[PDB]
Design a protein around this ligand. Sequence first.
Ligand SMILES: [Ca+2]
Ligand SMILES: [Ca+2]
Ligand SMILES: [Ca+2]
Ligand SMILES: [Ca+2]
Ligand SMILES: [Ca+2]
Lengths: 197, 200
Amino acid sequence: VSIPINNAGFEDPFIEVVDDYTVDTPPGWTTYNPNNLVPEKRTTWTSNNGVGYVGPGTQFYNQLAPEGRNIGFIYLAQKPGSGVAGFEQILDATLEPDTKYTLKVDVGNSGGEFQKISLAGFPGYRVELLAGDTVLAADHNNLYIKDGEFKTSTVTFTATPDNPYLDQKLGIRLINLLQGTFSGLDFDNVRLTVEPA
Amino acid sequence: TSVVSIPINNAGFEDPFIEVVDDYTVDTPPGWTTYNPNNLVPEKRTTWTSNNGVGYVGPGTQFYNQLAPEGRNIGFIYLAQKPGSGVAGFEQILDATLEPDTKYTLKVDVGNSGGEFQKISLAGFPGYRVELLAGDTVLAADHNNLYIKDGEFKTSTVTFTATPDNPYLDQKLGIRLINLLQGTFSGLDFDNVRLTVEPA
Ligand SMILES: [Ca+2]
Ligand SMILES: [Ca+2]
Ligand SMILES: [Ca+2]
Ligand SMILES: [Ca+2]
Ligand SMILES: [Ca+2]
């Protein structure tokens, strides 16, 4: 049983040309920006985020997008250690007790080169499940993902009747840790499902 | 060229020895420092201030349906402030340093103490985070990924692969075991810290 998420596979907007991309916050999401690394007005080369089309002929991946045409990316131009940024979405569903939540997202390490800049290397990722502003459970960079590949991160959480955050809105964050270069990474196919526990 | 254990001081909190079952210290365990980024833990502690220490979990224990995962003792962190006030726990910087083409495996048992202490319910859990460090950088971490019932321990596992281009190679490895203070009762236990390295 799914909890609906807006633009969960970053398929909005449609992108016609393979490897073309946007540099603005994907519809349905907000830019998680606790260290002000990402500017309000972006270019190709500022710190930015957006969606990109991974299809046949892609120069960056050894497979198609995990879901549909598009993935969501986050690029950070500041040096490693400067902070983090990413995607955030607050949901209408609220944290309920005796319920087990399962968050899954695919995490992508883009390979290849862009404007003769090597994409080799990875910044590290964090996937967060939130109630309000509280990170209930999170995968802080537990998966090793090679250049050009995707892997699925899974975060689960069970709320007890005594949890302090019951009735707050559930949220998701997909974070670029900026702990290495090349300092971009991708996400796709966000899924949140729920079951009695 | 094979799986090797990296030495950790007082890795099962067996120092100091504690004679009486369910008795405990309230000072930083030997070999570890108090991780205190939000200054929640005072330098001088009593039972009901924020604190940390070691505790003997043996036959007779009121807090678990099992004995200590390893040896006699566990290490604990208790926080008196309200949920949301910050985090605290244990930190230990190791002599070993981050090496390329290696896979690190950090394991620690996380305990959710149950029962009653001084008529206070130990029901509930603050949440935990287990961190593998190089220098000041959290390379990988288990932020509360296991559901742990009152009265049991579960093993948390954190893995990390260091590449030749990792920016933190040759920095000293570290371990943090953290009370998240995201619930009450706001205490939790750790035991049996293990770190291995192997060719990736
Ligand atoms: Ca997609
Ligand atoms: Ca890459
Ligand atoms: Ca995949
Ligand atoms: Ca022990
Ligand atoms: Ca408990």
